Amino acid sequence: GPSFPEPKVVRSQGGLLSLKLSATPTPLAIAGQRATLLTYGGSFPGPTLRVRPRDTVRLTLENRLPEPTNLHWHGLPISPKVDDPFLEIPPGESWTYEFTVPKELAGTFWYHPHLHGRVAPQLFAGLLGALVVESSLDAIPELREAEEHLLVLKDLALQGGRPAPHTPMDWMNGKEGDLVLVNGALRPTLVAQKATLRLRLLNASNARYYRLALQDHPLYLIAADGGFLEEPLEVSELLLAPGERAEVLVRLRKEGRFLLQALPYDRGAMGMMDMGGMAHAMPQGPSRPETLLYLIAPKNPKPLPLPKALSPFPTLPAPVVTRRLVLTEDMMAARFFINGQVFDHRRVDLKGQAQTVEVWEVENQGDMDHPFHLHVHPFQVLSVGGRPFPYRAWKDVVNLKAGEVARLLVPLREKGRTVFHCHIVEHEDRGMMGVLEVG
Numbered sequence: 001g002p003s004f005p006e007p008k009v010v011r012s013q014g015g016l017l018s019l020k021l022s023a024t025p026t027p028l029a030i031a032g033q034r035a036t037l038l039t040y041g042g043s044f045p046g047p048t049l050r051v052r053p054r055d056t057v058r059l060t061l062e063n064r065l066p067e068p069t070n071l072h073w074h075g076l077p078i079s080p081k082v083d084d085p086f087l088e089i090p091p092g093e094s095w096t097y098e099f100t101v102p103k104e105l106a107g108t109f110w111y112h113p114h115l116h117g118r119v120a121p122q123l124f125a126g127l128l129g130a131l132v133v134e135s136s137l138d139a140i141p142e143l144r145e146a147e148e149h150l151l152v153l154k155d156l157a158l159q160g161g162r163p164a165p166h167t168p169m170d171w172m173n174g175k176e177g178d179l180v181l182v183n184g185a186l187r188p189t190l191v192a193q194k195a196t197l198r199l200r201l202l203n204a205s206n207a208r209y210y211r212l213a214l215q216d217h218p219l220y221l222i223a224a225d226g227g228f229l230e231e232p233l234e235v236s237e238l239l240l241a242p243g244e245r246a247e248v249l250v251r252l253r254k255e256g257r258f259l260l261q262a263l264p265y266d267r268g269a270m271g272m273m274d275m276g277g278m279a280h281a282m283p284q285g286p287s288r289p290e291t292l293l294y295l296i297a298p299k300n301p302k303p304l305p306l307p308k309a310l311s312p313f314p315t316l317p318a319p320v321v322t323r324r325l326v327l328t329e330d331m332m333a334a335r336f337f338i339n340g341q342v343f344d345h346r347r348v349d350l351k352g353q354a355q356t357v358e359v360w361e362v363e364n365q366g367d368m369d370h371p372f373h374l375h376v377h378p379f380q381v382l383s384v385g386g387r388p389f390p391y392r393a394w395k396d397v398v399n400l401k402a403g404e405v406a407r408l409l410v411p412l413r414e415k416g417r418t419v420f421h422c423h424i425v426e427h428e429d430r431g432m433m434g435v436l437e438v439g
C-alpha cells in the first residue's frame with residue numbers, strides 16, 4: 001500500500017452519507033503485532049467520514065460490544081437530541097444518528113463513545129474515527145495544490161494481545177500508552193510528493209499531549225478545532241491536548257528527512273514515592289520525546305505561496321452573561337469537580353438562552369492540565385492565562401495549565417440539554433462534567 005497509512009475514507013454520495021458501522025472486538029495487526037481492539041468499521045482508527053455542508057448524515061451504529069455504548073459527534077454544532085450524551089445503546093442493539101451538516105462549517109471533527117463511566121476504556125481500546133467537513137475554501141489554489149493528509153495521533157498499550165487495563169493511577173492521571181502511533185501505525189514514513197503539505201491533526205488520545213514540532217521547519221496554522229483561522233499563523237511548535245484538532249501547512253524547505261516529534265511536555269501527571277517517610281505523591285515530570293513520523297521532502301522543493309486569507313471570523317453579538325466554572329482535583333481519590341460538584345445526569349448546572357452569547361471564565365485551580373470541552377456550542381477563545389489568543393477561530397476544547405483562567409465567548413446554538421467536561425476522559429468518567437440546558 002501507500003508508504004503513509006491513513007484511514008479509509010467514506011464520502012457522501014449525492015448529498016447523503018448513509019453508513020452502517022459496528023462497534024466490535026476486532027483481531028488485527030498493529031505496530032507489527034497481533035491484537036484484538038474495539039473498532040468501528042473493523043479498523044483502527046475507524047473510517048474517516050468526508051462530507052460537505054448541507055449533506056445528510058445517516059449513521060446506524062450497531063453495538064457488538066459486551067457493554068453499552070453511544071456516539072459523541074465531537075465538535076459538530078448539531079442538536080443534542082442527535083448528539084445525545086445521555087443515550088445508551090445496549091449490547092446487540094442499534095441506533096441511527098441522522099443530522100444535516102450545518103451550512104457554515106469546515107474542518108476536522110471526530111466521533112467516539114460518550115457513555116458516562118465507560119468512556120476511558122472504550123476510547124483507549126480503539127473506538128474513534130475522524131469526520132472531515134470539506135469547504136469551498138479547499139478550492140483556492142494555495143490549498144488545492146497542497147498534498148493533504150490526516151494524522152490521527154493516538155497512543156496505545158497492549159497486554160496479552162488486548163488493550164492494557166486501567167489501573168487506579170490511570171484513572172487519576174488519564175492513561176497513556178507506550179505505543180505512540182499515527183493513524184494506528186508506528187513511526188510511519190511520509191514521502192512527500194509536493195513541497196506544500198496540508199496536514200489535518202487530531203489528538204484522539206485519552207490523555208497524552210502532543211507538543212508538535214517538525215525538525216528545521218515552522219508550521220503554518222490554518223484551522224483550529226472547529227474552523228479556519230482568518231489568515232495563516234506561523235508557529236514554531238503546536239500543542240494538541242486531548243480532543244483538539246488543528247490544520248497546518250508545511251512548506252518543505254530543502255531535500256532531506258525531517259522528524260515530526262512530540263517534544264517533552266509536563267501536563268502534571270503524578271506518581272508515588274516512598275523515601276522512608278510514608279508514600280507521597282511526586283510529579284512524573286515531562287513526557288519523554290517521541291518521534292511521530294519521518295517526513296521525506298521531494299527533490300528541489302518549491303512550496304506554494306501561503307494563502308493571504310482564509311475565512312473571516314463572525315462578529316459576535318455582545319454577551320448577556322458571564323459564567324465562572326472552577327476546576328479542582330482530589331488526586332488521591334481520583335475525583336474531579338466543577339464548582340465543587342461531580343457530574344449528576346439529573347442535575348442541570350447552567351441554564352442559558354439560545355441565540356445569545358455568553359462569556360465563560362473557566363479556571364483551573366488544580367495542578368494538572370485540564371482540556372475543557374463543551375458539546376454542541378463552539379466557542380471563541382479570547383485569552384488563556386492572562387494572554388490574549390493570537391487568532392480568531394472556532395474551538396471546542398481549550399487547554400488550561402495549572403492556575404490558568406480561559407475566557408471564552410460562547411454563542412448558544414441548538415436548544416436542549418448537553419454537557420461540558422474535561423477531555424482527559426478518565427476525569428470525565430470520574431466526575432469532571434456538568435450539564436448545560438439551552439432554551
Ligand SMILES: [Cu+2]
Nearest residue numbers: 072074112243
Ligand atoms: Cu470528544
Ligand SMILES: [Cu+2]
Nearest residue numbers: 370422424427
Ligand atoms: Cu481533567
Ligand SMILES: [Cu+2]
Nearest residue numbers: 072114375421
Ligand atoms: Cu463530551
